[PDB]
Amino acid sequence: MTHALFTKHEDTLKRALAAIESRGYWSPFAEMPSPKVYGESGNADGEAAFKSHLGKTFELDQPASGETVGAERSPYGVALDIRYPKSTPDALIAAAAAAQRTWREAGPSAWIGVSLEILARLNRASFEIAYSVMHTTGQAFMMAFQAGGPHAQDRALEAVAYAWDQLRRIPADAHWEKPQGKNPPLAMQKRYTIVPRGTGLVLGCCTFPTWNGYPGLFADLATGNTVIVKPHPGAILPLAITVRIARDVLREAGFDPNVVTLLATEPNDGALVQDLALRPEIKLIDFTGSTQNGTWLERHAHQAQVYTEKAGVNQIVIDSTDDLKAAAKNIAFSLALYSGQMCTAPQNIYVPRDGIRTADGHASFDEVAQAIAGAVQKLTGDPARSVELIGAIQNDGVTARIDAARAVGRVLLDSQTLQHPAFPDARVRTPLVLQLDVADREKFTQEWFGPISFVIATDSTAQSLDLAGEIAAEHGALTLSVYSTADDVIDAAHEAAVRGGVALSINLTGGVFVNQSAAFSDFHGTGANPAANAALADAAFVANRFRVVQSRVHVAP
Amino acid sequence: MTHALFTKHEDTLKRALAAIESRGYWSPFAEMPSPKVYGESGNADGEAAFKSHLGKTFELDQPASGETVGAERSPYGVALDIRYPKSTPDALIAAAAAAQRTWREAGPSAWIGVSLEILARLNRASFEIAYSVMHTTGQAFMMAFQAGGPHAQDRALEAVAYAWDQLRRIPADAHWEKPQGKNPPLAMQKRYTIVPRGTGLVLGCCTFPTWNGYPGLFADLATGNTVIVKPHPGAILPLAITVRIARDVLREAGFDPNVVTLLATEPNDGALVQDLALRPEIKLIDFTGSTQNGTWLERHAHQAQVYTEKAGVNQIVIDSTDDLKAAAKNIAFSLALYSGQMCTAPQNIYVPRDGIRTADGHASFDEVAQAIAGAVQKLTGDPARSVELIGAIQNDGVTARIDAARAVGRVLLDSQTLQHPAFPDARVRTPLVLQLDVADREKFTQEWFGPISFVIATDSTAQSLDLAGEIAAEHGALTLSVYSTADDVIDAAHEAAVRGGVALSINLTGGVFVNQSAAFSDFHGTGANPAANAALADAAFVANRFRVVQSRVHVAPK
Ligand code: NA
Ligand code: NA
């Protein structure tokens, strides 16, 4: 029979199915933190819920050792002092294994129904999650709310819809009847059982814990697997809150709450994670993080299906424009948003050394560079007007990388530290913009984490496009952006995007930035290049997380 | 625009889509070699086409070194002396790369249409292909025709249908319009381009070259990839004919025929294959063969998506039956078919040491074992009555393993050499049936390729089922078969199949054998246990062979 939570959320599920196929605009979760949607005291109650976690041990009723763990620090300088019960990998693998049977037996309608109920409760907790994302990742509140709450919930629901889209096409049974020409037909009844892989592992991200973490977590749950969530040690709380709500729904639905457990760690957890990632019980791994750690998992966890999001080189090709100032302002927003700490933020900006055509005539390379650098300075230089745009720097390693990057080319706009007006100890810095030549490719085919960008002089737009496609294919990329008023250049940009396996944005001169993507329309990554071996989300992202075990028996024709 | 070959075969495509979802019986390719369907001279014309390949170099217009290659031998003792143009991996990778662009740009309707047209022509060549399978794999003619022709074509069409099932869900474009609170809406046009992975590699099998080879080949083609087909050096001709016909269709459709090339080799090609499998241009690999080689590819060809069919331990659990003679005969056919050289053939037969309940009373262990051994002897001992059932032994290594197996336990039925009445030099051997105890685990968890089986005494059906599920999960398995009249035992067998990740057959006492599987209903392998990392066929089998590259641009709102 159909699980009650499936029937409760069936309309939302059906709408999501239509959304992934039509790929227009759709979102069931209000992205604006409006009192109309979330209540007049939504913000206040959320903030108090966040504050209640500080200076205390986060309660989880999963098997735990009696020791605690946790060293999260707020980029805004707020004391956190949050602790979590320390569980061993052994203990969590055992608890997941004990939880697998009744979860599996409840079948797809339960996996989908429970997943959608959890998403409904996570949306209700959006403010509490927003504050927890802000004070672990450093995202400004508005972005922490959207990226940590509704937008992450959108991507989670997208994954559930893709899961259901595959599951719903597999019949529970079939009558197989083959005529035997005047002899009686062969007739058998086939029965098909959906069997999840087993236990999945979610290895969390330090900048977008829920947005990057949710697709794998809910792809696992929607296909009947159990999940161990191992967040980035600098951003545990958003996923601890998530796990708590998931366990509530599973417990109320009559399942073992250890279908989902939380493995909190402190930094230097590498040996622990390597050993856990190779355990025979771990059949799925979803990882967001460094290229070296991601590729390590792909090459060594042979017992698991490994899905990875890694670093890439995001690129802008500037050929020509209808309004240099509008293009420059859009690029500047894209560089300043969360201080370039988005996996989709642009890094390399290719401009012909001889300049570009504009509506107001020709612009030299130097004029294009000054237009970008000046627009960044206008957006970021004033603390009162810019802190909500640039947010806070995630870790103390960026300051050293900023100074390293200063030496790499010619400085167009220096990075400076700002004093946040509301957080005296916040770690805040404006973007660094450098000038390079195409001859310096050794410097710009690297990913530079933080607010660092290179305006790079090329021989021609043809070279910009050849290089951009080559670098995306070889070194990975999540986004590619082109500015041109010429149809043939736009066509060549599509060829480069196909070559590079990277999503293309064209003439972004308004309110859409290359950093942004919408669930149910935009594939996040392609899975074709070294920045990620999977796309968020498509059929391939979910279709392997379950198997089908059949049986056959003769029946009457 | 819709390719003409897509429109031509659209009705077959739509019916195949409906078939994979409902999973009843359906096949567009007639499995009987009937004159009604294939012409009154279908067999004769097919045999003449087969003979034309003997004693000459197989013609392909792909890049070649001028040298030839090929050392195929017929298990029936017929002189083949077939050679193929020798090409290097380097040359074929370059030729595929040059063919990729215009093939990719023609888009899904061309990939599907060309694939369906190739399948139509392969069906018309079924007799020629049947003879080529017979004289490389040793399959008797009827199985060579069905398994090499129509049934393989069924599985190819199944793979194309699953591919199209994913491709058709992706819009070519979308109008994305997002309302803005009292401001102009954000309006963008999205465009989605389906991009193949690149060049796929098909690593062929010596027993079922087309049946095992076609799903990967046509999944590759139907998703726009180029393909290098590397057959097993003992069974090239069936895939050489296939590649020839594929290239014909591609050429006639205005494509570079090097979308599909043939890399024929001589034996001991393992190092060449390793080097090829690791090339950065090889993005997909479909492999059928040993567990060790398949495992090597999964672990070391990290740049490719690897789909493998490997070895496993196929098992029968005998608990009880309503007709021992009928059950024994069915098991006997399953052991005798193609001399146990099917990847789905049973090897281990578990029987309680204290016997079983039947409808005609109690039967001892020795009575069950003798029932099986005697039914096998009746079906296989006489050349004239058995040759069309047991076929020929593929290579002399199977003969060696039969003799190794003789020493392992108590022989219930010895394997004999038969003189084929029509092929004086054919290699024909009857099944070897041995008795073991459950304590002999070290022996019966190994794979014994060939007509070798063990009737194994267990403490109870409880132990039989626990052992079968454990062995399937640890060592891999393609089939599990259970005989019981008890509902609780059937329930336990379902649990064992789920644990072992293996398809279950229940009370096969008639004309369906555990060896058999039908496209569009039976998943061949699950992908859950060590016998295979993929199922033939499902969504996971095709959904990763293409990617989607999108673009977005602002447009006017509606
Ligand atoms: Na950046
Ligand atoms: Na066998």
Helix/strand/coil (H/E/C) assignment for every residue in A101-131: HHHHHCHHHHHHHHHHHHHHHHHHCHHHHHH
* Closest C-alpha to A266, from A447, A19, A84: A84
Other beta carbons within 10 angstroms of residue A106's beta carbon come to: 17
* Cα–Cα distance for residue pair A370/B108, rounded to 1 Å: 46
* Cα–Cα distance for residue pair B201/A270, rounded to 1 Å: 36
Q: Which residues touch A515 (CB under 8 Å, ≥6 apart)?
A: A334, A337, A342, A344, A345, A346, A479
Question: Could you say which DSSP state residue A281 is in?
Answer: T
* Cα–Cα distance for residue pair B396/A192, rounded to 1 Å: 40
Q: Which ligand is nearest to the CA of A337?
A: 1
- Which tokens in the block code for residue B326? 């009928």
Residue A460's SS3 state is: coil
How far does residue A431's CA lie from ligand 1's centre (Å)?
Answer: 9
Q: A83 to chain B nearest CA, in Å? A: 38
Q: A123 to chain B nearest CA, in Å? A: 20
* Cα–Cα distance for residue pair B85/B71, rounded to 1 Å: 13
CA distances for B345 relative to A311, B331, B458, B472, angstroms: 48, 10, 21, 14
How far does residue B314's CA lie from ligand 2's centre (Å)?
Answer: 8
> Is there a single domain that holds both residue A153 and residue A189?
yes
Q: Which ligand is nearest to the CA of B338?
A: 2
- The HSE-up count of residue B438 (CA atoms within 13 Å, CB side) is 18
- Which tokens in the block code for residue B534? 């993929």
> Is there a single domain that holds both residue A126 and residue A238?
yes
> Is there a single domain that holds both residue A231 and residue A144?
yes
Q: Which residues touch B281 (CB under 8 Å, ≥6 apart)?
A: B93, B96, B97, B198, B199
Look at B25 and A503 and tell me if their CB atoms are within 8 Å. Answer: no
Q: Cβ(A318)–Cβ(A356) under 8 Å? A: yes
- Rg (alpha carbons) of chain A, rounded to whole number: 25
> Is there a single domain that holds both residue B545 and residue B404?
no
Q: Cβ(A154)–Cβ(A533) under 8 Å? A: no
- Which tokens in the block code for residue B518? 């039908």
- Which tokens in the block code for residue B501? 């990740």
* Cα–Cα distance for residue pair B17/B40, rounded to 1 Å: 32
Q: A515 to chain B nearest CA, in Å? A: 13
List the single best residue of A25, A284, A302 to mutate versus B (max B Cβ within 10 A).
A25
* Cα–Cα distance for residue pair B85/B91, rounded to 1 Å: 12
Q: Which residues span the domain enclosing A384?
A: 313-518
Q: Which ligand is nearest to the CA of A314?
A: 1
Q: Cβ(A398)–Cβ(A429) under 8 Å? A: yes
* Cα–Cα distance for residue pair A415/A386, rounded to 1 Å: 14
Q: B177 to chain A nearest CA, in Å? A: 6
* Cα–Cα distance for residue pair A528/A478, rounded to 1 Å: 10
Chain A neighbors of B326, CB-CB under 8 A: none
Q: Which ligand is nearest to the CA of B478?
A: 2
How far does residue A447's CA lie from ligand 1's centre (Å)?
Answer: 8
Chain B neighbors of A551, CB-CB under 8 A: 494, 497, 503-506
Look at A186 and B298 and tell me if their CB atoms are within 8 Å. Answer: no
* Pairing status of strand A432-437 against strand A410-413: antiparallel
Q: Cβ(A200)–Cβ(A285) under 8 Å? A: yes
Q: Which helix (H) or strand (E) holds B69?
A: strand B68-69
Select the residue of A176, A193, A508 nearest B521 (Cβ to Cβ): A176
On the 0-12 / 13-18 / 19+ scale of CB atoms within 10 A, B542 is buried
List the single best residue of B178, B299, B323, B526 to mutate versus A (max A Cβ within 10 A).
B178
Place of tokens 């805004």: A76
Look at B543 and A547 and tell me if their CB atoms are within 8 Å. Answer: no
Scanning B223-338, the segments in alpha helix (DSSP H) are 237-252, 270-277, 291-300, 324-336
> Is there a single domain that holds both residue A60 and residue A102?
yes
How far does residue B450's CA lie from ligand 2's centre (Å)?
Answer: 5
Scanning A197-314, the segments in alpha helix (DSSP H) are 209-222, 237-252, 270-277, 291-300
Chain B's closest residue to A514, CA to CA, is B552
* Cα–Cα distance for residue pair A67/A85, rounded to 1 Å: 6
* Closest C-alpha to B519, from B117, B118, B27: B27
Select the residue of B174, B186, B505 nearest A512 (Cβ to Cβ): B186
Q: A414 to chain B nearest CA, in Å? A: 32
How far does residue A432's CA lie from ligand 1's centre (Å)?
Answer: 10
Question: Could you say which DSSP state residue B29 is in?
Answer: S
Select the residue of B543, B544, B551 nearest A497 (Cβ to Cβ): B551
Q: Cβ(B41)–Cβ(B33) under 8 Å? A: no
* Closest C-alpha to A524, from A538, A509, A506, A512: A538
Q: Cβ(B207)–Cβ(B394) under 8 Å? A: yes
Q: Which residues touch A496 (CB under 8 Å, ≥6 apart)?
A: A317, A465, A466, A468, A469, A472, A480, A504
Look at B543 and A548 and tell me if their CB atoms are within 8 Å. Answer: no
Q: Cβ(B256)–Cβ(B517) under 8 Å? A: no
Other beta carbons within 10 angstroms of residue A539's beta carbon come to: 23
Look at A178 and B544 and tell me if their CB atoms are within 8 Å. Answer: no
Look at A21 and B171 and tell me if their CB atoms are within 8 Å. Answer: yes
Query: Domain total for chain A?
Result: 2
Q: Cβ(A485)–Cβ(A353) under 8 Å? A: no
Place of tokens 């039976």: B522
* Pairing status of strand B503-506 against strand B479-483: parallel
Q: Per DSSP, what are the bridge partners of residue B410?
A: B435
- Which tokens in the block code for residue B340? 């146990």
Q: Phi and psi at residue A240, in whole multiples of 5°?
A: -65, -45
Residue B193's SS3 state is: strand
* Closest C-alpha to B475, from B451, B441, B517, B515: B441
* Cα–Cα distance for residue pair A127/A123, rounded to 1 Å: 9
Per 3-state DSSP, chain B is made up of helix, strand and coil in percentages (nearest 5) of: 45, 20, 35
* Cα–Cα distance for residue pair B253/B417, rounded to 1 Å: 50
Q: Which residues touch B217 (CB under 8 Å, ≥6 apart)?
A: B156, B200, B202, B227, B229, B242, B260, B286
Select the residue of A501, A535, A549 nearest B503 (Cβ to Cβ): A549
Look at B538 and A543 and tell me if their CB atoms are within 8 Å. Answer: yes
* Pairing status of strand A282-288 against strand A260-262: unpaired
- Rg (alpha carbons) of chain B, rounded to whole number: 25
Count contacts between A and B (CB, < 8 Å): 175
CA distances for A510 relative to A130, A318, A329, A333, A348, angstroms: 27, 16, 9, 10, 20
CA angle B144, B147, B148 (to 5 degrees): 65
List the single best residue of A176, A470, A529 to mutate versus B (max B Cβ within 10 A).
A176
* Cα–Cα distance for residue pair B417/B382, rounded to 1 Å: 10
Q: Cβ(B214)–Cβ(B221) under 8 Å? A: no
Q: Cβ(A336)–Cβ(A380) under 8 Å? A: yes
- Which tokens in the block code for residue B143? 């199985």
On the 0-12 / 13-18 / 19+ scale of CB atoms within 10 A, B45 is middle
Q: Cβ(A159)–Cβ(A220) under 8 Å? A: no
Look at A23 and B511 and tell me if their CB atoms are within 8 Å. Answer: no
> Is there a single domain that holds both residue B317 and residue B307?
no
Place of tokens 């001279």: B41
* Closest C-alpha to B169, from A21, A62, A66: A21
How far does residue A430's CA lie from ligand 1's centre (Å)?
Answer: 12
Question: Could you say which DSSP state residue B257 is in?
Answer: G
Look at A553 and B494 and tell me if their CB atoms are within 8 Å. Answer: no
Residue B185's SS3 state is: strand
* Cα–Cα distance for residue pair B175/B192, rounded to 1 Å: 12
Q: Cβ(B51)–Cβ(B78) under 8 Å? A: no
Q: Phi and psi at residue A261, in whole multiples of 5°?
A: -130, 165
CA distances for A445 relative to A382, A459, A492, angstroms: 31, 17, 21
Residue B363's SS3 state is: strand
Select the residue of B299, B543, B554 nearest A540 (Cβ to Cβ): B543
Q: Distance of alpha carbon B297 from its chain centroid, rounded?
A: 18
Select the residue of B169, B302, B547 nearest A501 (Cβ to Cβ): B547
What is the crossing angle of helices B365-380 and B383-390, to 10°? 100
Residue B357's SS3 state is: strand
> Is there a single domain that holds both residue A478 and residue A381?
yes
Q: Which ligand is nearest to the CA of B433?
A: 2
* Cα–Cα distance for residue pair B111/B259, rounded to 1 Å: 11
Q: B538 to chain A nearest CA, in Å? A: 9
> Is there a single domain that holds both residue A500 and residue A523?
no
DSSP strands (E only) in B424-511? 432-437, 452-458, 479-483, 503-506
- Which tokens in the block code for residue A414? 């220096």
Other beta carbons within 10 angstroms of residue A447's beta carbon come to: 19
How far does residue A207's CA lie from ligand 1's centre (Å)?
Answer: 12
Q: Phi and psi at residue B321, in whole multiples of 5°?
A: -155, 155
Chain B's closest residue to A283, CA to CA, is B528
- The HSE-up count of residue A443 (CA atoms within 13 Å, CB side) is 21
Chain B neighbors of A25, CB-CB under 8 A: 176-178
* Closest C-alpha to B222, from B306, B122, B107: B107
> Is there a single domain that holds both residue B160 and residue B216?
yes
- Which tokens in the block code for residue A316? 């802008």
> Is there a single domain that holds both residue A228 and residue A362?
no
> Is there a single domain that holds both residue A138 and residue A189?
yes
* Pairing status of strand A173-180 against strand A183-196: antiparallel
Question: Could you say which DSSP state residue A430 is in?
Answer: P
- The HSE-up count of residue B432 (CA atoms within 13 Å, CB side) is 27
How far does residue A450's CA lie from ligand 1's centre (Å)?
Answer: 5
Q: Which residues surround ligand 2, an ion (CB under 5 A)?
A: B 340, 345
Scanning A228-323, the segments in alpha helix (DSSP H) are 237-252, 270-277, 291-300
> Is there a single domain that holds both residue B490 and residue B536?
no
- Which tokens in the block code for residue A176? 């197989």
Question: Could you say which DSSP state residue B488 is in?
Answer: H
Q: Which residues touch A290 (CB under 8 Å, ≥6 apart)?
A: A310, A311
Chain A's closest residue to B543, CA to CA, is A540
Q: Per DSSP, what are the bridge partners of residue A361?
A: A358
Q: Cβ(A483)–Cβ(A318) under 8 Å? A: yes
Question: Could you say which DSSP state residue A528 is in?
Answer: S
Look at A171 and B302 and tell me if their CB atoms are within 8 Å. Answer: no
Scanning A407-551, the segments in alpha helix (DSSP H) are 441-444, 461-475, 487-500, 539-542
Select the residue of B174, B494, B538 nearest A548 (Cβ to Cβ): B538
How far does residue A539's CA lie from ligand 1's centre (Å)?
Answer: 30
| Experimental structure resolution, Å | 2.0
Q: Cβ(A93)–Cβ(A199) under 8 Å? A: yes
Scanning B194-253, the segments in alpha helix (DSSP H) are 209-222, 237-252
Chain B neighbors of A196, CB-CB under 8 A: none
Look at B539 and A543 and tell me if their CB atoms are within 8 Å. Answer: yes
How far does residue B334's CA lie from ligand 2's centre (Å)?
Answer: 9
Sequence length of chain A is: 557
Listing DSSP states for A18-76 in one string gives HHHHH-SS--SS--S--HHHH-TTHHHHHHHHHHHTTTSBPP--S---S-EE-----TT
Q: Phi and psi at residue B208, in whole multiples of 5°?
A: -130, 70
Place of tokens 């392998």: B525
* Closest C-alpha to B281, from B223, B222, B202, B198: B198
